[PDB]
Design brief:
The complex is a heterotetramer, with two copies of chain A (151 residues) and two copies of chain B (150 residues). Chain A contains six helices and five strands; from the N terminus they run ββαβαβαβααα. By secondary structure, chain A is α/β, with parallel strands linked by helices. Chain A has a single domain, classed as Protein tyrosine phosphatase superfamily (Protein-Tyrosine Phosphatase, Chain A). The longest helix of chain A has 17 residues. The termini of chain A are far apart. Chain B has a single domain, classed as Roll (CBS-domain), CATH 3.10.580.10. The chains are: A alpha/beta (151), B alpha/beta (150). Chains in contact: A-B, B-C, C-D. Chains B, C: Belongs to the ACDP family.
C-alpha cells in the first residue's frame, strides 16, 4: 500500500507499512514529508532503526499480537506518548506502522482520535475512507467496546 | 450489427467489475526480478509478443514493477545485467485497484493515465491476524475494450 | 458519463471512413527493407515503443511487409542480418483497404483477422496514364477504438 | 494488387500485374493455379520471359500506349488469339497484365467479353466488381464507342 496522514485537533499521525532495509531512505523522505518526529512499530523487526534515528526521528518498538487488540498498558503508554510529544512539538506528526497498516496500527490511531473527541462511527468511517478495509472483527470488537476518558 | 453489440457493452461498463474481465493471477505472464537479461532470456521476453510484463520478487503475488519491452533498448547481452537494474532505470506507474471498481471508472483511469494496466486486489476480513490486501489478478485496457466490442 | 460518449462513437462507426481516422503516410513511423539489424538499429526499433512497424522498399508508398518487434527474437547483432531476411522468416498478413471503407466494416475485419493494421489506398481517375491505387495512410485497430472511446 | 480470374462462355482470363524478377516463381505458381497457358504483356519489360516459357506458358509482348486505347491491329490480333488458343485448349486460361492491371489489360479483357456476347455496362460492372476502379476516362471512351462483331 502507501502511507496515510490523519489529522484531528492538532493531532497528526501517519499510518504506514513495514519497510525493508533498501526502501528505508525513500521511507525517511516520506516520514519527513509529513513531518513525523517519532515512529512506533507494532510488527516484528525486519530492519534496523539506527539510521532512522540518525535522521532525527525516534523509534519505539512496542509489538503486540497480530490481528489482536492492544493491552491496556500499551493503550496508556500510547496516550501518554501522544500527549507528551504533541505538547513538546504541536502540529508535528507521529507515525505508527503495522505490516501494511491495516489492523493494529489503525486501531491505535483509532483510540487516539476517539480519546480526542471524535465518535466511534465517525472515526472508523474516517479511517476506512483513507484506507479501505482497515479493521477486522477482533479489532472491531475492541474499538466498539472501548471506553473513552477525554485524555 | 457491430453497433448494438458495442452499445450493450458500453452500458454494461457500469455494472461489470474489474474482477469479471481480469486475467487471474494464475494465468498472467510474469517475470522474476532475479532474471538475468542474457541472450536467451531477452530473446524469450521479446518472442512472447507482450509489450509489458509484470515483474515479481519471491512469490508471484509480490508484484514490484513493470518491464516494458522497449526498456531493453540498448542492453548488452554479453553483460548479463540483472532485470532489477533495468527496472530501476525506467519509471512505469504501477496502479492497484479493488475488485469493486466498475469498468467505466477503470476505463476513465486508463484514459487519463500513462499506465494501461492495473493489479486487482481484494481485502479479506477473515483471519486470525491483521487484514491484508490479496492480489487477485491484472486488468488491462485491452480487457475492458475486449469487453466493449466483444 | 463514458457511456454516452462510447455510444455516440459506436453509432458514428457507420458514417466515418477509414480515411478520417488513419495516420497519413507522412506521419506513419516506418523502416526500410535495406536496414541492417545491427546493435544500434535494433535498439532504435525497440526503443520506439511500436509493436509492429511497416517495412518499405524504395519510396515509402511502396510498403512491402510488417516487422513485428517479436520477430527480432533471436537475431544476433554481430551478424548484421539485413531486415529483408527477417521479413522473409515470418508471415504477417498485409491488409489493404479503400478510403471508402466505413469504420464498422473495418472493425469487423479487425475482429476476424490476425493483422490489426491496414494500408489505406485510393484510386485516381485523373491521369495521362492507367489508373493506379495511391496509398494514403495506415489505419489500426487502435485508431478505430480511439474513435469509439474518444 | 493481386491477380483476378474472369470467366464467360468457356473464355477465362487472368488480369494481373507486372511482376519483378524475384517474384516470378510464385507468379508462375499463380499462373498455373488458374491454368493459364499464354500471357500477353502491355507494360514495358522489367524482367525476362524465358523461364515462364520453360514452365510451359508462352509470352507475347504487345506494348501499346499507357493510359490509352489499343489500336485496331492489336484488337484483331487479340481476338484471333483468343479464338485460336480457346479452340486449341478449351476451358484453359490466358493472362493479360498491365503494370497493376487497372487500364489497358482490363480494356482487352473488356473487348473479349464484349465480343463474346456480354453487354457494355454488364461487362464494365463485371470487371470493376472484380477489381475496383478499373478504367479511366480515355478508356471509357473507347469501350463505349467500340463496335462489336460477334467474333
Amino acid at each position: 500500500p502507501a502511507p496515510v496522514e490523519v489529522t484531528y485537533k492538532n493531532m497528526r499521525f501517519l499510518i504506514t507499512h513495514n519497510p525493508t532495509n533498501a526502501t528505508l531512505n525513500k521511507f525517511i523522505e516520506e516520514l519527513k514529508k509529513y513531518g513525523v518526529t517519532t515512529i512506533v512499530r507494532v510488527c516484528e523487526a525486519t530492519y534496523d532503526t539506527t539510521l532512522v534515528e540518525k535522521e532525527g526521528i525516534h523509534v519505539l518498538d512496542w509489538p503486540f499480537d497480530d490481528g489482536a487488540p492492544p493491552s491496556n498498558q500499551i493503550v496508556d503508554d500510547w496516550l501518554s506518548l501522544v500527549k507528551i510529544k504533541f505538547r513538546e512539538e504541536p502540529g508535528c506528526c507521529i507515525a505508527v506502522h503495522d505490516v501494511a497498516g491495516l489492523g493494529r496500527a489503525p486501531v491505535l490511531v483509532a483510540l487516539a482520535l476517539i480519546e480526542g473527541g471524535m465518535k466511534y462511527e465517525d472515526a472508523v468511517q474516517f479511517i476506512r475512507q483513507k484506507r479501505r478495509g482497515a479493521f477486522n472483527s477482533k479489532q472491531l470488537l475492541y474499538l466498539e467496546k472501548y471506553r473513552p476518558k477525554m485524555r | 450489427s457491430e453497433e448494438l453489440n458495442i452499445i450493450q457493452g458500453a452500458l454494461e461498463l457500469r455494472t461489470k467489475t474489474v474482477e469479471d474481465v481480469m486475467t487471474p493471477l494464475r494465468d498472467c505472464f510474469m517475470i522474476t526480478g532475479e532474471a538475468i537479461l542474457d541472450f536467451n532470456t531477452m530473446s524469450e521476453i521479446m518472442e512472447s509478443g507482450y509489450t509489458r510484463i509484470p515483474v515479481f520478487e519471491g512469490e508471484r503475488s509480490n508484484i514490484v514493477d513493470l518491464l516494458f519491452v522497449k526498456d531493453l533498448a540498448f542492453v548488452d547481452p554479453d553483460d548479463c545485467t540483472p532485470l532489477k537494474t533495468i527496472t530501476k532505470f525506467y519509471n512505469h506507474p504501477l496502479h492497484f485497484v479493488f475488485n469493486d471498481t466498475k469498468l467505466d471508472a477503470m476505463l476513465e483511469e486508463f484514459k487519463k493515465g500513462k499506465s494501461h494496466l492495473a493489479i486487482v486486489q481484494r481485502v479479506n476480513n477473515e483471519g486470525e491476524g491483521d487484514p491484508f490486501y490479496e492480489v487477485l489478478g491484472i486488468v488491462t485496457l485491452e480487457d475492458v475494450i475486449e469487453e466493449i466490442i466483444k
